C-alpha cells in the first residue's frame, strides 16, 4: 500500500542482529578473505610450472571460488540487508547451486587428498606402478563433475518468493526454499551426509591408519637395523648367500659378479660392490612392505597383525623378515597367544622354539618387545627420525580437527533450519539462529584460509 512507502509491511522478515556484530563479522570476513585469497592463489599460481599436487591444486581452487562467489553475496543479503533478495530468481537458484557445488568440491578434495596419501604411505606396491598422470587427471575431473550433480537439487529447492504482508511489494522478495518442509528436510540431509559425514569418516579413518603405518616404519627401522645389521659392502649370509644392507638377499647364485650384477638393477649405478646408507634404506623400505604384503594376504598372520599395536607389529615384521611368511606362520600356538593379548604366555612358548636357540640374543629382544609393547630392548632410538614421526601425526590430526571445527557448525545450522517445526520456533530461537548464522559461516570460510596452510605442510 501507499506506493509512497518503501519499507512497507515487511516486519515479519526483519532480523534483530546488532550493527556491532555486523561490523565484527565483516571485519572477520575481510581478514579471512584477504588471507584465503593470497594463500589459495600462491598455492594455485606456483603450481603451474609425484602427482600429489594435482589434488592440492584442485583443493586450492575450490577454496578460492568459495571466497570469491559465495562470500560477497552472503555479506550483503545474509549479514547486513537480510531482505529483499537483490539478485532475482535466477540469482537465487544460481547462488545456492554454486555455493553447494563448491562446498562439495572442497570436502571431496579433502577426502581425496587423504586417499592418495593413504595409497602412498600404507600401500607402496599398489601405487608406485598403477597411478599415472592420466588416472590422477580424470580422477579430479570426476570430483568436480560429481560435486556439480549433487548440487542439482538446489536449483529446485531454492527460489524467489514474496512474503510481504501486502499482496505485492518489492521489499518482501526473499531467496528461500520454495518447497515444503519435508522436501527441504530430505535435500539438507543428503547434502549434510554426503559432504560432512562421508569425508569425516573417510578422513579420520584413513588418517588414523596412516599414523599407525608411519609409527610401524619408525619402529621396524631400528629393530631390524640393530638385529639384522647395516653393512654398506657385500657380505656373506649365514646360510652362505650374498646379502647387503639390512639383510637384502641378493642371490643364491655363488657367482660374485652375478651378485654385483643384480646389486644395481635396483640401485641404478655401477657401484662395484658398495652402496650408500640412503640406498640401503630404500632397499629396506621395499623389503618391509613385501613382508607386510605377505602378512596381509595370509589368513593365519593378518588377524594377529591387526590386533597388535604399532610397536608389536614391527616385532612381527621383524620375525617375518628373518624367517619368511611360512616360517613365522609355522608358529601357530604363539600367534593365537599373541591374538589373545597374552604376552607373558606367548613370550615363554617362543623361548622354546628353534628360532630362539639359533639367535638367542636377537630372539629375546623380539620377545621382550612382545612383552612390553615398547622397543626398550633396542634403546631409546634416533631422536631425529622419531620426531618427524610425531610431526606427521599432529598434521593428520590437524586435518581431521580443522574439517570438523570448520564445517560441523555450518551443517548443524542448516539442520536447525528444517528440523525445528513451526510450533517450536520461539522469538529467542529466531534471533539466536541469525547470530548463530554469523559464527558457523565464519568458521566455514576459515577452512578456505586454513587449508592452504595445513595441506602445504604435507
Amino acid at each position: 500500500t501507499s506506493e509512497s512507502d518503501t519499507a512497507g509491511p515487511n516486519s515479519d522478515l526483519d532480523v534483530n542482529t546488532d550493527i556491532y556484530s555486523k561490523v565484527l563479522v565483516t571485519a572477520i570476513y575481510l581478514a579471512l578473505f584477504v588471507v584465503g585469497t593470497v594463500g589459495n592463489s600462491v598455492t594455485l599460481f606456483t603450481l603451474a610450472r609425484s602427482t600429489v599436487h594435482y589434488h592440492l591444486g584442485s583443493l586450492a581452487l575450490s577454496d578460492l571460488l568459495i571466497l570469491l562467489l559465495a562470500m560477497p553475496v552472503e555479506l550483503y543479503n545474509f549479514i547486513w540487508v537480510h531482505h529483499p533478495w537483490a539478485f532475482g530468481d535466477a540469482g537465487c537458484r544460481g547462488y545456492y547451486f554454486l555455493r553447494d557445488a563448491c562446498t562439495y568440491a572442497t570436502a571431496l578434495n579433502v577426502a581425496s587428498l587423504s586417499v592418495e596419501r593413504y595409497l602412498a604411505i600404507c600401500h607402496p606396491f599398489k601405487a608406485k606402478t598403477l597411478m599415472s598422470r592420466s588416472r590422477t587427471k580424470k580422477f579430479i575431473s570426476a570430483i568436480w563433475l560429481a560435486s556439480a550433480l549433487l548440487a542439482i537439487p538446489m536449483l529446485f529447492t531454492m527460489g524467489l518468493q514474496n512474503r510481504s504482508a501486502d499482496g505485492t511489494h518489492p521489499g518482501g522478495l526473499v531467496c528461500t526454499p520454495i518447497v515444503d518442509t519435508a522436501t527441504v528436510k530430505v535435500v539438507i540431509q543428503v547434502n549434510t551426509f554426503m559432504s560432512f559425514l562421508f569425508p569425516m569418516l573417510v578422513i579420520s579413518i584413513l588418517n588414523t591408519v596412516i599414523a599407525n603405518k608411519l609409527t610401524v616404519m619408525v619402529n621396524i627401522f631400528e629393530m631390524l637395523r640393530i638385529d639384522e645389521g647395516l653393512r654398506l659392502k657385500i657380505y656373506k649370509d649365514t646360510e652362505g648367500y650374498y646379502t647387503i644392507g639390512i639383510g637384502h638377499l641378493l642371490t643364491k647364485s655363488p657367482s660374485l659378479n652375478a651378485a654385483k650384477s643384480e646389486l644395481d638393477k635396483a640401485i641404478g649405478r655401477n657401484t662395484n660392490g658398495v652402496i650408500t646408507k640412503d640406498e640401503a634404506e630404500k632397499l629396506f623400505n621395499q623389503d618391509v612392505d613385501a613382508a607386510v604384503r605377505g602378512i596381509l594376504r595370509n589368513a593365519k598372520l593378518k588377524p594377529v597383525y591387526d590386533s597388535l599395536d604399532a610397536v608389536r607389529r614391527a616385532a612381527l615384521i621383524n620375525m617375518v623378515f628373518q624367517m619368511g611368511e611360512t616360517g613365522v606362520a609355522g608358529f601357530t600356538n604363539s600367534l593365537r597367544m599373541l591374538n589373545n593379548k597374552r604376552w607373558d604366555e606367548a613370550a615363554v612358548n617362543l623361548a622354546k622354539s628353534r628360532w630362539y636357540n639359533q639367535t638367542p640374543n636377537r630372539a629375546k629382544r623380539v620377545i621382550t618387545t612382545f612383552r612390553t609393547g615398547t622397543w626398550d630392548a633396542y634403546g631409546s632410538g634416533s631422536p631425529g627420525r622419531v620426531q618427524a614421526l610425531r610431526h606427521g601425526v599432529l598434521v593428520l590430526r590437524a586435518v581431521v580437527i580443522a574439517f570438523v571445527v570448520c564445517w560441523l557448525p555450518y551443517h548443524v545450522r542448516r539442520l536447525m533450519f528444517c528440523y525445528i517445526s513451526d510450533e517450536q520456533w520461539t522469538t529467542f530461537l529466531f534471533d539466536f539462529y541469525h547470530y548463530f548464522y554469523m559464527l558457523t559461516n565464519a568458521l566455514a570460510y576459515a577452512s578456505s584460509a586454513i587449508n592452504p596452510i595445513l595441506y602445504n605442510l604435507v
Binding site: 531482505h83 528461500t176 541469525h434
Partner: peptide, 6 residues
Amino acid sequence: RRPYIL
C-alpha cells in the same frame, strides 16, 4: 516464525 535464510 521460521527463518527464511538458508
